[PDB]
Design a protein around this ligand. Sequence first.
Ligand SMILES: COc1ccc(Cl)cc1C(=O)NCCc1ccc(S(=O)(=O)NC(=O)NC2CCCCC2)cc1
Ligand SMILES: [Cl-]
Length: 438
Amino acid sequence: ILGITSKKIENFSDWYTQVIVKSELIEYYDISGCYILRPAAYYIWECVQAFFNKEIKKLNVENSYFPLFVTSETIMYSVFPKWIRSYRDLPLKLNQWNTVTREFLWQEGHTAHKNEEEAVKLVFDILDLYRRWYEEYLAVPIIKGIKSEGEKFGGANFTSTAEAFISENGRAIQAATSHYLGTNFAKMFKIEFEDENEVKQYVHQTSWGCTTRSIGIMIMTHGDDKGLVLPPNVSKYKVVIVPIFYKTTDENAIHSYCKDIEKILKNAQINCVYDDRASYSPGYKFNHWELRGIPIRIEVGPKDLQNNSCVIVRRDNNEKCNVKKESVLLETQQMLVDIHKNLFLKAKKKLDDSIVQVTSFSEVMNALNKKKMVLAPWCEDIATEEEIKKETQRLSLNLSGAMKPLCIPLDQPPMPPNMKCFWSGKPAKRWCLFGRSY
Ligand SMILES: COc1ccc(Cl)cc1C(=O)NCCc1ccc(S(=O)(=O)NC(=O)NC2CCCCC2)cc1
Ligand SMILES: [Cl-]
């Protein structure tokens, strides 16, 4: 009852709710579904917040706060004409860190540029920062792409997106967005400027956001039947030290030895916890910290005193090795790196193995039935989006069983000149990724 009672594959929904509560990420307030972000969850948000802030500031984006909202977007663009008069006032680059299933925390950026080229470059610069956000900190692989006309934001010229995929239930989920808004809102609010030639021009706008859904995607990606699995970059404690006594003493020697290891790690700015609670067995502690997603366990028993060593246990694959005491710092540092690398790579394999490249709709149900996505040549006719939804829904009988256009990947496979649309039989335009979704 203390651990996870539902297998991730067999009952994904119940598994997830158990993991997020028992790992002490969240705490449910009442029956409304409202929840509290405990330190373990907020810490992850703080890590990626710190990363994102440093990177957008390199792009001269400035943080700010706009408190007025309308049902849900921020009141902002109508103020821009008061700030923009000439090309010297451009580019305007703003970001806000907001607080408000539902999502409590998120980030939202807005820019305005003198032309299309500069705005579009920012759109994709930001999009890659989202990629790094997921990869370098959450160890989650994403796919960058363009939304179809039927799935893009209404006010956007085009919507670029990062897509993640949960292989266990065969569903894609939108991980982040970066819109090119063109001049759509500039026309609405007369957001105009005089260029270098004293000519009136429309500003070109972008908006981009990412929420705490990123944390959920991380959990769903890496979590296992033992509970939470944290990439070291978003775990407060990198290491837990567990003492092992055999009642034959010396507990004090073990205790002292563990404190030596704790000191070495902490002196190297590697935060860790020494679980010296007398009331709980070592086996109890193993579960306790595995459940909470601690990347590395260091065990110390009698044999380790004898051999001047310690046992290191990886959280991601449960592999154990003996390590000399004088080598603990270096090997722990390398282990933390390799754990992140392994989490990403094994997640990327599951993602790559989830994409079935097809040329005909007759290949689609085979891929959906195996809980995968399809990559197909598509004429991109907006009317066909609903047709494809309705038909895949009909053929599967099945929380939606429909597949939708996820994104047109920035990385396109070659397109043969005479390639037809997998659905309409018309000339294909580009390869599009289709799948079931959240
Ligand atoms: C619809 O139910 C299901 C029915 C059947 C199956 Cl087979 C699976 C599911 C399912 O969907 N199971 C996961 C339920 C789920 C997962 C992710 C999201 S979310 O959008 O990503 N939101 C967040 O993660 N917030 C995080 C939570 C952790 C702390 C920090 C904030 C929202 C809900
Ligand atoms: Cl506004």
